[PDB]
Design an enzyme around this catalytic site. Structure first.
Site, short mmCIF file in Angstrom:
data_model
loop_
_atom_site.label_atom_id
_atom_site.label_comp_id
_atom_site.label_asym_id
_atom_site.label_seq_id
_atom_site.Cartn_x
_atom_site.Cartn_y
_atom_site.Cartn_z
N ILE B 67 0.90 -1.43 0.06
CA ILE B 67 0.47 0.06 0.24
C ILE B 67 0.70 1.36 0.91
CG2 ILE B 67 0.19 0.48 2.59
CD1 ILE B 67 -3.21 0.00 -0.16
N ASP B 68 1.56 1.23 0.99
CA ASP B 68 3.27 2.65 0.45
C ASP B 68 4.14 2.04 0.68
OD1 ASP B 68 2.17 2.15 3.53
OD2 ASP B 68 3.92 4.02 3.05
#
Ligand SMILES: Cc1cn([C@H]2C[C@H](O)[C@@H](COP(=O)(O)OP(=O)(O)OP(=O)(O)O)O2)c(=O)[nH]c1=O
Ligand SMILES: [Mg+2]
Lengths: 1005, 218, 419
Positions: B67-68
């Site tokens: 996600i990041d």
DNA sequence: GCCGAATTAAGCAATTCGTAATCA
DNA sequence: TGATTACGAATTGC
């Protein structure tokens, strides 16, 4: 504390999980109570004594009966009894989730268990005791034993409430705004506190005005503030910088209101405010829990709802806020989509649908007219609502086509008086509504000055107040209270779930009262089954009165009468040949006598079978019938309160609520027919439908060819119960109270499920209504039985049938007379369909009226009517093609977006995806959009239409037809002419005309 | 290898031909969010934002998606710790070594395996603030993930809460496996057998399985 | 994500491997798993199958008709018997080549198949050959074991095994009709053999060779022959009296043979077979009314309309012969198997199977024949629609309807007696 | 130091339109 | 180059 009335229940999602109750006292003080929230499990004594780590807490639920509700097929009358057990049961509560192998009652939620086991209603008034409450903060207490705290209930009392309604208006140059480029121009607030004070104020950005303009605005009466601490809400217009505007918005949104109501604010308004605040400054909007131990930041999140039909697929999207302070953030957009059914769900369309009135002309001349509205013009209440909305309205639509600007407005004691800049119109009574505005926002932003700023301030304050007007029109508060009371759900969860969830609280209460648990062992297998019966209409045009007779809650009453539940099914007997079938029938008629057992014949389950009989018991009341009785009682209550209503708003609200309860009652049966449900029962649904078909056939046979002569009425057949013999009289001759001189004959023409149409050989409506009332009373007294009743709906004049579900007529209600205005009724025609056209509807209406008038006059020499209609149609369509004077709004169709398609090629989804790819504004997964057919302007008339779905174009709010584009008239003309041809009687000339124009063969009924 | 020029930093994007039909749109979506994004120190450095666009897409079968980036010390290629310090890479290496049996290892990289592409949904992150650049990246992330899913056969999403609505963010159907993040408390990743399921699905779709022990470094 | 999902996926892949060699239960499980996998993972490489046409040509090549050359490696020779062909899989039902349907098999054969499958799991499929109620092993393959020991424990179980031959060659030899005849003589089996399959140690593929010649033979008359309890095999004689063998009566109908005509035939050294692939009602009535009125069809077999009797019931009840109705309750308690079999099984099907009726035609006759009953016994009957009576087999079944009803009443009032 | 939180789904009957598949 | 049929999708009525 002492007397408290509840407002909301909400959860906390930190390291420690709690449940919160928000309440208010008589004086106006707000009180929060915090409870520990557990996970609830139901086990037996033998399992309870064998739990290696002992549970946190267990409570004795007493002796309960567990029944297996699986359904099996039997080939002979040797039927085994249902597996039933009786055992002590315990309800255990766990701080954290535990897996227990043989736990029962696993379909119910934790909040429902809390409410029902603690004896607490989500929307009640209570008199708490402080012996069980400890103060943990100023205005926040902690309760450890909710059973005794809420033991005393008191009558309901009224409390004040606080509201915030807001709207924003953002700058844009070429398309939809973007947060990274375009600023915020206006922010409008309507504000109601606990003291009943209503305040309206609009904040204007001054960073897009010249200094001289700011000075003249201050000279004109506005207020200029340079800091957050020097704002007063008592000033209507305040101009400030963008940062101060966002800080004021943040301060307002962090308050502990009760309702923050917005129209499409969760997707646009709040999101834009949050993102712009985070871009210009590093600040965030922070919510705190009542105990000041959990703090969260605002971040809208998305809930996607999938379909239960084929290939599942996503079908709806909704946006929600993540606050934990008790405030309810309400979006009217989602509510209106899930509630009503319209062509478009924009704010203008909803305003036009909701706020309309009839106005009387008082003056003419120049470029304006004056209208008045009063209780003597439309109805009791409509003028009041129109005057209420006119306090802030700017533009009024007359005759559904003209848009006009308000010059002067006066709110009389009873109605309204308005002056509009409108051309001269030669009539006396006209229609007024609040709708679109004929302004170009992009052009106004292009050349921005003080006057445009003030006009946009007016528009924005009106947009903010429409939220309150719609909030009062739809009765959200009453609906919320009713739903929280009935469904046993928190006030913030009433409008979020479907039938499978809102019927669980009453079901759990019923099961605990009856001391019953239902379990399943093997898998569920799905087979098709048949539905209601629809009769074929006997003729198209009638020219005689038609009387409509309708059952009351047919399927729930069938379920109650037969006691159709999954746990009351003795068995199903099947046969593969006539010999075994006869043996089984002879034995079955005597092993299971009629008064206690009911036997239903059904269409066979499998191709190799020739019979199927399902047996149901009636000694002990089932579970589904009691749910249906509860919902039926609620519907009766709300109908009774509708009957005593006087104003229009109350009538509308109560009608909506009784309709909602009716739909829930039908949804219970639908669930009984649904595979993935816990109440699945194939036999029960089949039997319900079979009994319905039997009842319609019985009524139709009794009514077809019935004669009223002297004071006696002779029915067609013997009034015999079609299920088993009873003690009623079966005489087909009954004595009436009508005048002796009457003499009439009755014939049956049409019917759908619980409805029969009966033709009477007369024309007056007073006599027809009298006979209808007497006949209804006789049918209820002598023909029907048990809990079956019928109702006399209306009298239909000039009834026109086209197909099995398409008919138009003029309606006279039961409480009506000859000197009363009828009501035009359309059912299934191409005037209620949302995907036909607007041009199509006008043409079909004018031609239907012309045809009726021509048939009334009557020439029909050889085929005069057909020739005249076809010639007129040809002339009209040729004129429309040549002139091109009709706008694009008359050629726009509507469709809903979703991703539930077999195969992913699917031109519709590709069209919507391409639009989303090439445009700023996005169409979501439950949104309705407009589209039309567009073709290059150089093409001539087209005979053979080869590819139609390649010409579909999406029409947005900023669409202007190009100089090299034209509306593709051929599709619309083809559909319209097919519908015209299907009404007439000649064939040769119609086919010749169709082949000459479009080169195809018309389809006929 | 082609190159395109943008207004702001890193001023240049070098891309493989397989990413041709997205690049133009990417530029138009990057010139409107770069000024705000570059006001803060980010992990990774701006120069390493688009170094996964060099890899080809015509020979890939499985995508592993976060996600990041790492909150600190991001390298640009997802899920790499050159000194073998980050917890997620350590735990994924432990699970895959347990599956494959190799015991002596000093590091593990997902960018060496053949047929596997590692991806981050959001391509940038503030130092110490997970999911702090979502609004800047939304459109770019959606577009690039949709382009990837037109080539791969299985998509592996790490993170239950983050990828709950991944089917709504994608148009065309594709095989999707959503599991737990390696760095999740309540030890959920240890009892995860997603790699074997990935291999079974690939062999079910007439595709070669993945040599999951190839990424080890000795 | 979990382990149950992993085992479900493994089972789905295993079923997908073996689909042509499958039955209805395996197909249902495969479709259920496919639906579950598509629902869970939104996309799966396999799609639902509905037709499932079984085929055997994957493991076989084109039949040879000319002499060839062989030399290297040891060779295993297996003869091909005559009769219907059945396919067996791991824990599956009976399937027929091209017309796969549930065919009844003896309980002992089912038990032997179950025990041989439980002995080892290294069996792909088994090819069975049937010839007038003579179940014979035809073919067995395995990627791990060898076709020697498997036949060994099949023999020791109690089911007969074909005499597979093993031969060795050093020099370039020519295989022709002479070698085929030598192998046939070495077999020393009187059963009709069509072809010989020769395989090599290690190679999974099996290749057959067959030799035959074309001929034309006349047809004189038709006669049926008994081999068991009211089951028939047809036979037609020629002018010279030569014996002809045919697959089934359905072969006779499909050949559209006519009385006193000449037809093609594949003739060999020992025996010959009539060739098929030369409306249906005309032939199906011509064959029977030529052979005789007292004939009707039970699938592939022919049968009389005999009067039958209580012996025709007690023979299949596995009980001692008796003719006293009162005693019919004693021996029932002597054997648990008999009482269990009669309790579980119904009444109508009992009389149907005692008289050896067909299923479909009997049912379609009964469903259009009104009955009047009393105290669970038939006392009157009449026909309403005679369309099905246009089928001569329906009339033949109707002929012994009185004996049918009599045995029906006997069954019902004895089962009432013995509960 | 470097996530995840339990769960939130009515039925069939009839018509009208376009496109793909099959038949002379 | 046409007639005809089968299927999916959208909508309304119960
Ligand atoms: C409207 C509707 C009806 N039905 C079924 C069940 C109803 O018994 C039957 C007849 O529909 P209606 O006559 O519309 O409903 P009703 O029987 O409740 O009648 P009333 O309002 O006069 O009391 O159709 C549904 O299953 N779902 C629905 O949404
Ligand atoms: Mg009704």
């Amino acid at each position: 504390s002492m007397d408290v009335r509840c407002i909301n229940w909400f959860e906390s999602h930190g390291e420690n999980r709690f449940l919160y109750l928000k309440s208010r006292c008589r004086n106006g003080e707000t009180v929060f109570i915090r409870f520990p929230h557990y996970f609830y499990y139901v086990v037996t004594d033998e399992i309870y004594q064998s739990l290696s780590p002992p549970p946190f807490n267990a409570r004795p639920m007493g002796k309960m009966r567990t029944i297996d509700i699986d359904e099996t097929i039997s080939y002979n009358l040797d039927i085994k009894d249902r597996k039933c057990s009786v055992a002590d049961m315990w309800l255990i509560e766990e701080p954290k989730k535990r897996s227990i192998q043989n736990a029962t009652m696993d379909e119910f939620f934790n909040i429902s268990w809390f409410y029902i086991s603690n004896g607490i209603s989500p929307d009640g008034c209570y008199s708490l005791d402080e012996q069980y409450l400890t103060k943990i903060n100023n205005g926040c207490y902690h309760c450890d034993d909710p059973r005794n705290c809420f033991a005393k209930e008191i009558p309901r009392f009224d409390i004040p409430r606080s509201y915030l309604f807001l709207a924003i208006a953002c700058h844009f140059d070429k398309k939809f705004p973007s947060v990274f480029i375009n600023p915020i121009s206006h922010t409008s607030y309507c504000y109601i506190d606990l003291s009943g004070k209503r305040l309206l104020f609009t904040l204007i950005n001054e960073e897009m005005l010249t200094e001289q303009e700011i000075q003249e605005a201050v000279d004109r009466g506005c207020l200029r503030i340079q800091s957050l601490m020097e704002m007063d809400y008592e000033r209507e217009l305040v101009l400030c910088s963008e940062i101060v505007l966002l800080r004021i918005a943040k301060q307002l949104l962090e308050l502990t209101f009760d309702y923050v109501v917005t129209f499409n604010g969760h997707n646009f308004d709040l999101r834009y405010i949050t993102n712009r605040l985070e871009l210009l400054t590093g600040e965030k909007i922070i919510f705190r829990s009542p105990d000041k131990k959990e703090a969260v930041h605002l971040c809208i999140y998305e809930r996607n709802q999938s379909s239960h039909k084929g290939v599942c697929g996503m079908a709806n999207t909704t946006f929600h806020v993540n606050n934990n302070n008790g405030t309810i953030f309400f979006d009217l957009y989602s509510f209106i989509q899930k509630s009503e059914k319209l062509d478009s769900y924009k704010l203008d369309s909803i305003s036009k649908n909701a706020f309309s009135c009839m106005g009387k002309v008082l003056n003419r001349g120049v470029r304006e007219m004056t209208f008045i509205g009063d209780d003597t013009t439309d109805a009791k209440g409509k003028a009041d609502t129109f005057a209420k909305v006119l306090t802030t309205g700017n533009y009024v639509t007359v005759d559904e086509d003209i848009i006009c600007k308000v010059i002067r407005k006066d709110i009389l004691e009873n109605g309204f008086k308005v002056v509009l800049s409108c051309p001269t119109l030669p009539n006396d009574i006209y229609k007024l509504s609040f709708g679109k505005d004929d302004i170009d926002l992009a052009q106004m932003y292009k050349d921005y000055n003080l006057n445009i700023a003030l006009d946009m301030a007016r528009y924005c304050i009106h947009d903010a107040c429409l939220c309150q007007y719609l909030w009062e029109y739809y009765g959200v508060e009453t609906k919320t209270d009713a739903g929280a009371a009935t469904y046993v759900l928190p006030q913030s969860m009433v409008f979020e779930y479907r039938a499978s969830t809102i019927i669980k609280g009453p079901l759990l209460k019923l099961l605990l009262e009856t001391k019953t648990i239902l379990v399943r062992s093997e898998t569920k297998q799905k087979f098709p089954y048949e539905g209601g019966k629809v009769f074929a209409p006997k003729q198209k045009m009638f020219s005689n009165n038609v009387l409509i007779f309708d059952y009351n809650s047919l399927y729930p009453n069938v379920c109650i009468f037969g006691n159709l539940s999954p746990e009351t099914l003795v068995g199903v007997v099947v046969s593969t040949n006539r010999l075994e079938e006869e043996i089984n029938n002879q034995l079955l008629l005597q092993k299971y006598p009629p008064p206690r057992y009911i036997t239903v014949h059904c269409e066979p389950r499998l191709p190799n079978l020739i019979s199927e009989i399902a047996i149901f018991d009636r000694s002990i009341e089932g579970t589904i019938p009691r749910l249906l009785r509860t919902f039926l009682a609620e519907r009766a209550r709300y109908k009774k309160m509708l009957k005593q209503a006087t104003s229009s708003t109350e009538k509308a609200i109560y009608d909506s609520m009784q309709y909602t309860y009716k739909i829930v009652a039908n949804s219970v049966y639908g669930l009984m027919g649904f595979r993935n449900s816990a109440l699945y029962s194939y036999a029960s649904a089949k039997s319900c439908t079979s009994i319905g078909r039997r009842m319609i056939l019985y009524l139709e046979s009794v009514l077809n060819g019935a004669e009223l002569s002297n004071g006696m009425l002779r029915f067609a057949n013997t009034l015999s119960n079609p299920f088993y013999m009873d003690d009623r009289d079966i005489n087909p001759i009954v004595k009436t109270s009508l005048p002796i001189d009457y003499r009439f004959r009755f014939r049956s023409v049409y019917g759908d499920t619980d409805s029969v149409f009966t033709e009477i050989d007369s024309q007056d409506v007073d006599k027809s209504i009298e006979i209808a009332k007497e006949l209804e009373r006789l049918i209820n007294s002598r023909v029907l039985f048990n809990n079956f009743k019928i109702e006399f709906e209306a009298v239909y004049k000039n009834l026109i049938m086209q197909s099995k579900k398409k008919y138009t007529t003029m309606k006279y209600s039961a409480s009506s007379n000859s000197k009363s205005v009828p009501e035009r009724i359309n059912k299934g025609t191409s005037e209620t369909r949302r995907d036909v056209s607007k041009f199509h509807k006008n043409m079909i209406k004018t031609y239907k009226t012309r045809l009726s008038e021509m048939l009334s006059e009557g020439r029909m020499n050889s085929n005069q009517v057909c020739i005249d209609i076809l010639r007129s149609l040809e002339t009209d369509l040729r004129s429309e093609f040549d002139s091109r004077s009709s706008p694009l709004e008359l050629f726009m169709l509507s469709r809903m977006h979703h991703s539930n398609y077999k195969s992913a090629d699917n031109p519709n989804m590709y069209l919507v995806t391409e639009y989303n790819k090439n445009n700023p504004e996005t169409i979501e997964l439950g949104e309705r959009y407009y589209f039309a057919y567009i073709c290059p302007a150089n093409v001539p008339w087209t005979k053979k239409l080869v590819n139609i779905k390649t010409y579909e174009t999406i029409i947005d709010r900023s669409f202007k037809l190009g100089s090299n584009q034209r509306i593709f008239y051929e599709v619309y003309f083809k559909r319209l002419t097919s519908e015209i041809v299907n009404l007439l009687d000649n064939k040769v000339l119609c086919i010749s005309f169709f082949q000459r124009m479009f080169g195809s063969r018309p389809t006929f009924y | 290898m082609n190159s395109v020029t943008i207004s702001h930093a890193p001023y240049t994007i070098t891309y493989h031909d397989d990413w041709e039909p997205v690049m133009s749109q990417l530029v138009e979506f990057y010139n409107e969010v770069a000024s705000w994004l570059l006001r803060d120190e980010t992990s990774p450095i701006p120069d390493k934002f688009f170094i996964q666009l060099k890899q080809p897409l015509r020979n890939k079968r499985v995508c592993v998606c976060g996600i990041d980036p790492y909150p600190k010390d991001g390298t640009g290629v997802p899920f790499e710790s050159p000194n073998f310090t980050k917890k997620s890479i350590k735990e994924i290496a432990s699970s895959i070594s347990r599956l494959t049996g190799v015991i002596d290892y000093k590091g593990y990289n997902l960018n060496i395996i053949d047929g596997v592409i590692p991806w981050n949904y959001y391509l940038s992150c503030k130092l110490g603030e997970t999911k702090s650049h979502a609004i800047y990246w939304d459109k770019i992330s959606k577009l690039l993930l949709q382009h990837i899913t037109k080539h791969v056969s299985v998509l592996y999403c790490l993170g239950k809460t983050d990828f709950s609505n991944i089917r709504a963010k994608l148009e065309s159907p594709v095989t999707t496996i959503v599991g737990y993040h390696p760095a999740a408390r309540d030890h959920q990743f240890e009892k995860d057998r997603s790699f074997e399921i990935i291999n079974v699905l690939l062999e079910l779709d007439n595709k070669t399985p993945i040599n999951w022990a190839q990424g080890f470094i000795y | 994500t979990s382990s149950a999902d992993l085992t479900n996926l493994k089972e789905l892949l295993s079923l997908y491997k073996s689909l042509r060699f499958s039955d209805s239960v395996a197909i249902e499980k495969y479709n259920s798993l496919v639906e579950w996998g598509t629902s869970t993972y939104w996309k799966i490489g396999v799609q639902k199958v509905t037709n499932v046409e079984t085929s055997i040509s994957d493991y076989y090549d084109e039949v040879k008709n000319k002499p060839f050359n062989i030399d290297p490696g040891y060779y295993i020779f297996l003869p091909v018997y005559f009769g219907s062909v059945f396919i067996y899989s791991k824990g599956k039902n009976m399937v027929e080549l091209g017309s796969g349907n549930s065919f009844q098999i003896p309980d002992e054969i089912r038990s032997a198949c179950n025990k041989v499958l439980d002995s080892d799991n290294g069996i792909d499929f088994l090819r069975f050959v049937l010839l007038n109620n003579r179940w014979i092993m035809e073919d067995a393959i395995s990627k791990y074991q060898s076709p020697v020991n498997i036949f060994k424990l099949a023999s020791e179980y109690g089911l007969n095994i074909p005499n597979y031959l093993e031969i060795e060659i050093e020099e370039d030899t020519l295989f022709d009709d002479e070698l085929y005849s030598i192998m046939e003589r070495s077999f020393d089996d009187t059963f009709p053999k069509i072809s010989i399959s020769y395989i090599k140690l290690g190679e999974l593929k099996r290749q057959v060779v067959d030799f035959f010649k074309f001929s034309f033979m006349y047809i004189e008359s038709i006669k049926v022959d008994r081999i068991g309890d009211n089951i028939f095999i047809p036979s037609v004689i020629t002018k010279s009296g030569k014996k002809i063998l045919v697959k089934d009566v359905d072969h006779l109908i499909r050949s559209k043979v006519r009385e006193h005509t000449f037809v093609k035939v594949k003739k060999k050294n020992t025996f010959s077979i009539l060739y098929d692939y030369d409306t249906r009602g005309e032939v199906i009535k011509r064959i029977i009314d030529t052979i005789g009125r007292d004939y009707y069809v039970n699938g592939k077999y022919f049968s009389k309309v005999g009067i039958a009797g209580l012996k025709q019931l007690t023979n299949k009840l596995d009980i001692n012969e008796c003719a006293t109705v009162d005693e019919l309750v004693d021996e029932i308690n002597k054997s648990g198997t008999v009482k269990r079999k009669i309790k579980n099984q119904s009444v109508f099907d009992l009389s149907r199977e005692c008289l050896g009726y067909p299923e479909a035609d009997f049912i379609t006759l009964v469903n259009n024949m009104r009955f009047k009953i009393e105290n669970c016994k038939v006392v009157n009957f009449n026909i309403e629609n005679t369309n099905c009576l246009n089928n001569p087999s329906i009339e033949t079944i109707y002929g012994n309807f009185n004996q049918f009803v009599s045995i029906f009443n006997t069954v019902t009032d004895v089962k009432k007696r013995l509960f």
